Amino acid sequence: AHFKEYQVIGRRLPTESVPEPKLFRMRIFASNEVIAKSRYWYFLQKLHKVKKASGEIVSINQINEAHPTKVKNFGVWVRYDSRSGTHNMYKEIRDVSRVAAVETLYQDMAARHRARFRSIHILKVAEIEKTADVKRQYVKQFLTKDLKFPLPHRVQKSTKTFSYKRPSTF
Amino acid sequence: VTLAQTDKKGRENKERIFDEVREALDTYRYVWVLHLDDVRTPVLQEIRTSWAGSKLIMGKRKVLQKALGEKREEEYKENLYQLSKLCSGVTGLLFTDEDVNTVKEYFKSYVRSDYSRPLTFTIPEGIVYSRGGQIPAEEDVPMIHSLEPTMRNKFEKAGKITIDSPYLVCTEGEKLDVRQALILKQFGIAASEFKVKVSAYYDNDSSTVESTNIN
Amino acid sequence: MKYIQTEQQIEVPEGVTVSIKSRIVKVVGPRGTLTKNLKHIDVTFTKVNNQLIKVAVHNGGRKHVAALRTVKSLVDNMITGVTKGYKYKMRYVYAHFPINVNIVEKDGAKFIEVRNFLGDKKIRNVPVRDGVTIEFSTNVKDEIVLSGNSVEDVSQNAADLQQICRVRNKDIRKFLDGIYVSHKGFIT
Amino acid sequence: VEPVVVIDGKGHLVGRLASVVAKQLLNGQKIVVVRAEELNISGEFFRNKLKYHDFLRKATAFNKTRGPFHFRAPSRIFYKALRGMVSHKTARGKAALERLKVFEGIPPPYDKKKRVVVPQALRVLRLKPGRKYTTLGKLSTSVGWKYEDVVAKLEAKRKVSSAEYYAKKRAFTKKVASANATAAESDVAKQLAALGY
Amino acid sequence: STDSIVKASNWRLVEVGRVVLIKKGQSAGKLAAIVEIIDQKKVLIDGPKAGVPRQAINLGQVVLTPLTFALPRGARTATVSKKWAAAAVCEKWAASSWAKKIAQRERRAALTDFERFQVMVLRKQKRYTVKKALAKA
RNA sequence: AGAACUGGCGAUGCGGGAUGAACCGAACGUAGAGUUAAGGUGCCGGAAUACACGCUCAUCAGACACCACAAAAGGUGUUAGUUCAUCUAGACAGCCGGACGGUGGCCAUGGAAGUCGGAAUCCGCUAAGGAGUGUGUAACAACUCACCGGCCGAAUGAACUA
RNA sequence: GCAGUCAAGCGUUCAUAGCGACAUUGCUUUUUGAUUCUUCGAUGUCGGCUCUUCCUAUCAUACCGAAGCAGAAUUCGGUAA
């Protein structure tokens, strides 16, 4: 769905003789609130020895985009599970917001490398501030000055089943 | 894919020649840059052994341009950048310290004979030979038949190779083809003279740029 | 990887003019006129000024861009044929049977005739295409010379002339008869 | 919207046309399809020949007459692809195929009437550019239709007669448009413009 | 007549400042100017005078209009609004025939039955003068 | 062929899997309106030739669990990736020039002079050039590469992952 | 198949744990075309006359490719029922 980027904060358990466990925050991409709490324990159990019954979640926050109408180049580090063993991948997306860029990534992974939602891990999504350090080629070609490209051979969608005009393109 | 012994040198060899030019300047007071486009390899060696006190360095252009310092402001020793701009051809720098007269006397006196890359020779209308009419044909040995598919293709009966029409490989007053150079080259005709030329001299302690031309 | 646009540049010298409606290309110059169809190749031609013409493919993949380079190679071959022209000179090595080659006109069709090839009584005919002139090389023994404006009119008729004389059921290393293309060059 | 609708067959795809025709016949509209020999099939030519040959060998072993009748004509090829879409064994399917008439070329009286096209079945709107297609008129010639030298000749006779009509029609519209232009600026013209005509 | 007659094949091509028309969506028939092109299929549009909010849109939902004006790449909404007035494209749009055709079928839908009667009586009067002017010359 | 826990068929229809005792939804009085399950929405056939990002061309393509098909291993066909090197002090491709003296090195010998062969296998001078990559003369020569150099001006090469 | 020599690959972070392809080397009755007439035992029923079709995994005819093929004669391979 429309992903929403969430901050989840976790505090293991207040016990006698160990007060104040430190605190643990993460940034989670999930389609709603309830998945992001469950996606939180999926990673945080891998990092150190906790459980959901030995845990509680402090607070959740919805992180909006800082600047939607600005156009950003994004470099995304991705770890994912293949049919063979897992291996890393670095990909670059040009998009409008952070949370819309992950939308175009999962579609890109499912198209080319046939990876569903459960196999992919999102390592770090970063904005590349300066230009001319863009590594990939297919992102780089839009950075040329005075870029103008035509859209030839446009089709037309007409509601009536019969048209009399012998219809023509552009 | 190959299995040859000799391997690529790399960037470090380009910085070694960058190192050799710097040390050669302050040691030997005269610097000589030359336009030597076509040279033979034993011709290059005998110039080195005729100048035993000298050090001679050949190398790539922008390396030798930067080793003198291609910028005006940046240089090893002073007034060095004007001579570096002049040398357009393939260069080999020279470092002798005896005389400004002996060196320009040497290159004008020195001359050899190499390939044309002038005079005209016709192939006789009989059986062709390796010399091709240089010596009398009774002393001549016929050409190898294996290089005849090279002659029917690249140069455009019995194993002795036969032409039926007379062919002229050169004509006088004419620029020779790159193909017509190879016709004289295969026959073994080194009748064109070869001479090396110099464009500029430099003196370190005088520290001025000298401009000249000999052809 | 969906290249956004790719272009090449076809140079036009002073002798020739080119007039292009949708994809039909006409080349008119000194030696003659040549035409070529291009409805299948899907490009866009654009003149800048009278000597350079850019071709362009917008938003095409690798297979679409690979066809764009050979469009430049076809139209450049058309221009040189109108200026310099093409000339293929062929020699025919016979072992024991002398090959008689003649040019006979059959109701206006101008067929190239081959006789006595390797002791065959079969009389082969090779038709001359439109826009190619065959003449025999004066003062050079054993040569047939093909010359024309178009590459595809000449080079096909050169290749058709050699495959009609192909040796069968024999070791080809010992039997060396045939007609071969010596070299490919220009008229001027 | 009309009693009998005449579909021009040129530049369409076999399947995507026959789908939208078969729904109109089951809804009661009468459709007559002309110029069948200009119809197109996606995919390259050598494919669609072999899709016909593996069909062509399928016939009843004990008596070849009783098997699938392999029709050759481009109308009959197209009528096949439509017949599989309508449930032709019931009484609803028989009365739905009596509303359909498919012809090669344009025979009289259908040359005097308007021909239409179907935008969701045009080749030039459906397939991507740089993609091989196949002309059905060439296809039936490769499998035994001995009439492409006749139907194409009658079209060259027709189009000359049709070009004379259009020039007479275009000059008459020129007189009307000139008369309509000088009729403008009148008080009846300006009141119409306010109302939008 | 030694000239190369090679055709141009003129096209509306996307750029910074190509004004467009949004056919479907929330906006539904409003003008807007492309601010920055994102990739092959998405752009970034804004029209402040018409009323469309600044948003990223797919090129499927938008149609290209031939009018252009000069505007720097990546401009904000205040800067597009100032360049919009200097070109005066809202006056240049209604001069075009394609804007008049939009307004005409809008007016023909809002015609009252009594006004639909008045359209009838006038066209009966207009055809009388035409058929006299026709069939004489 | 013989067991273990639970559900089902046998005794049980109805909707879905074209068809089917066992799968999926759901268990039945007679009827009306409403919303859904599993499954589906080009046409048969009720229902979007809806929207959105990509991939794939097959001279036997492919289309949905139970289920009616397939193996290793190959394929400059295409796509996205990893690790590595080269490069605006000029890379990759192209033409063009150099590719030498000790030394025709030693045994093999009718004769390989780098290249029928066998062991062996360094220096000199070098920007660089093998006691030699191949075409081969009966042995020579010559040509080519592998090594640099001059033109030439944007990235390129190699293995591997799926 | 067994007994070996390897190591192109793999073993959670890894050579020497543990496998381990293509390879490679060996006997199981005679390295000198001498022999050596060794047909060493299938435990539910089909064969042939007539007469059609179909599969291709092609013996012959058609056109091709490669050869370590002069011609002839053959050997190997492809399309093809």
Numbering used by the authors:
A (entry chain S): 2 to 171
B (entry chain W): 10 to 126, 132 to 170, 176 to 234
C (entry chain H): 1 to 188
D (entry chain O): 3 to 199
E (entry chain M): 2 to 138
Lines from the paper:
Ribosomes are the molecular machines that all cells depend on for protein synthesis. However, ribosomal subunits are exported to the cytoplasm in a functionally inactive and immature state, requiring the further addition of ribosomal proteins and the removal of transacting factors that block ligand binding sites. In the cytoplasm, the pre-60S particle follows a hierarchical pathway of assembly events coordinated with the release of biogenesis factors. Using cryo-EM of 60S precursors trapped from yeast, we captured six intermediates in late nuclear and cytoplasmic 60S assembly at ~3.5–3.8 Å resolution, which provide unprecedented mechanistic insights into 60S maturation.
